[PDB]
Amino acid sequence: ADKLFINALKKKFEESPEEKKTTFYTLGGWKQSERKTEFVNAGKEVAAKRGIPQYNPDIGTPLGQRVLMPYQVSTTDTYVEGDDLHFVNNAAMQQMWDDIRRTVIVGLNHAHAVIEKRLGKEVTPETITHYLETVNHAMPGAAVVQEHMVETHPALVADSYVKVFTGNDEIADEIDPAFVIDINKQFPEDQAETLKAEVGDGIWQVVRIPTIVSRTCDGATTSRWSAMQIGMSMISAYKQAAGEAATGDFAYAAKHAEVIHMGTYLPVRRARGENEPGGVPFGYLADICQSSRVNYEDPVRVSLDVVATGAMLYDQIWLGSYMSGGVGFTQYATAAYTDNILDDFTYFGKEYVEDKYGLCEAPNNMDTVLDVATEVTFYGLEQYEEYPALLEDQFGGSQRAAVVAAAAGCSTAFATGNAQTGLSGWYLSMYLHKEQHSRLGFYGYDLQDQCGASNVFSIRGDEGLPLELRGPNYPNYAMNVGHQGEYAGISQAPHAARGDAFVFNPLVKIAFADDNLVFDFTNVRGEFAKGALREFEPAGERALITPA
């Protein structure tokens, strides 16, 4: 019956969502808001304590001449003021990033070959389990060889550990299950078969370093820290000299030859090492999100969970802090994961496709792009025109451009089963939207949008790439809000419609299928809500080593 966003609009405003007029200016300004009132009071306290003015509602212009709205976290019944979705104020969002940043995947295949071929020693499921006991003591920062070592406090580093996975069920069954990511438990049968076949007899470690270290340091720490403690545990468990020539082979394997970073390093203007947000390709972000293994009968839900994951990380933390800062970009991102708005538009498109072509059954060509992206764009824009409350909700043109094009591009990919025609549909949506309303986004929103159509199918050096391989360092995408997380969703979309177990890297997909993570990647939007309510318990806090 109702569009999916109607309940949220009725919560925000006294008027029915269709009504065109309202009342302004008599709401009390900031005084209408519980959260702004909290902030006013805290600012006075802070300024007095430190002897320097801080938050003051009388500086600049007076917030709250209109309704300061609640937001529904999409797929939840949780309604919060938008400040509770700012990454600074939301521990769930900070932990989501920490859990990615502090992860690396490191093979044991080369390592086991060094042991067998260079050292002449045996590797068995028993020696692997012994090694895994050893590395789970050492990885958080504790000693195995030298006398008079000082160590990290176990409780400060409780979130760091090492697990393994392999496609060989019989071998997996022989390793203590405390250390194993069980692919057959975590994934539905057809997905498990695909993932096991991709891994084969390879054995891979998923290493998580301590959040407290990641926060003190940076993402490029992760693979170094991992390798040091892998190295020590190989010495201890396999009876090497503690520092012989073979020890260097384990180092080079763990740091270079068999490591999978979450993010690659960035060029000098935006200089950063590995495991920073800009290095994480869109296909990896889709695979980090675990919606695919729990919501696989609903491709829209899978795709929009990916969009939530990426809009928060890429717009709020990455573009809104690493690349800028200040108040930042909360609502540029919340547009993609609140009020069930993107959900309504994308369900529309999925239904359109299902009825016309069947999922994955449309021709992979421009005719399909023109059909589906145009239809879905016109639907979404019509909703802003029919529901003035919707338009006042997603008040910035950029937000609207992102949401409408995300639906258009995901729907096109649902039709073709191919992310590249989904991307073409995203750009067509932009062009149509711009002409319809004689506006699109902010001053710089459509840099990538105007380069977009020509670069979708280019094959040139710094232009051509399948969408799955693109990321925040693809040149056209390196600067602007309201695109990156949506592109992760479009990358996910054809794979979700196809029922594929992963989008770009099966190892990354399996690595986040782990109940010992702090953040729950199977329910990203639920976790955002939990953090907004101040109900999420992050790792990395220093309470144990500070005064009461």
């Binding site: 050292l119 060889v145 030298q146 006398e147 000299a241 503690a242 520092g243 012989e244 020539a245």
Partner: protein, 247 residues
């Protein structure tokens, strides 16, 4: 060759360890099997593992250097490269870390030597390692109280001695027997128990340790008092410094 400057007993002992024509004093007898046991790389009577085929089974590139340089026997055979590692007490052990690495590359062919403060290692092909290790264990390179064979957990070079005059060992590989005055090796160099301990003989007495040591200390012969040795080190500093600026 002259090896090392200086007019102390320390300096002469450093020269003697380097000089391959100097016959190292043999202090103890150790069987072939017991060298293998201490090393801990293979069991007595186990065939040597290989890392590549014997050189006569391989087609090498035509290469005058290969023709001119005779491979050691373990290289001909394709043996693993394995190690032996020693720790030397700063309380007057006969050999010390740089003295070992310098001597090893004067005396032994095909050698990878590494020097650290608490450990010193040689890596070479396994069957050649066994031959070298006999000499390192039986001669004045080694004292069983002031030196230790240790492939891990090396702490002790800088520690006080125990009541028997033995260096600290976290894993207690070498045990002094109060009833004989002799030291027994009860574990291999990585710390695994031996079936049958190895007799390492009596520790050297204080006078003999002083005669044989290669460390300078104020309570032995101090470095600052070996003025010719100091002069040469200062000369090298000055000449390196000038050379980096101009020639």
């Amino acid at each position: 060759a002259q090896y090392y400057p200086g007019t102390t007993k320390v300096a002469q002992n450093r020269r003697n360890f380097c000089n391959p024509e100097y016959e190292l004093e043999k202090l103890r007898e150790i069987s072939d099997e017991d060298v293998v046991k201490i090393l801990g790389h293979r069991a007595p009577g186990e065939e040597y593992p290989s890392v590549h085929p014997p050189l006569e089974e391989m087609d090498e590139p035509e290469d005058a250097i290969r023709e001119m340089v005779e491979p050691i026997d373990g290289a001909k055979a394709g043996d693993r490269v394995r190690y032996i590692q020693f720790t030397d007490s700063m309380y007057f052990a006969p050999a010390q870390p740089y003295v070992r690495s310098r001597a090893y590359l004067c005396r032994y062919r095909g050698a990878d030597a590494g020097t650290l403060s608490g450990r010193q290692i040689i890596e070479t092909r396994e069957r050649d390692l066994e031959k070298i290790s006999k000499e390192l264990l039986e001669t004045e390179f080694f004292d069983p109280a002031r030196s230790g064979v240790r492939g891990k957990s090396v702490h002790g070079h800088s520690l006080r001695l125990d009541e028997d005059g033995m260096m600290f060992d976290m894993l207690r590989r070498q045990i002094y027997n109060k009833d004989t005055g002799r030291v027994e090796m009860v574990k291999n160099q990585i710390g695994d128990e031996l079936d049958e301990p190895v007799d390492l003989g009596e520790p050297l007495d204080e006078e003999t340790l002083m005669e044989k040591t290669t460390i300078y200390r104020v309570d032995g012969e101090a470095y600052r008092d070996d003025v010719e040795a100091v002069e040469i080190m200062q000369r090298i500093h000055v000449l390196r410094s000038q050379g980096g600026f101009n020639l």
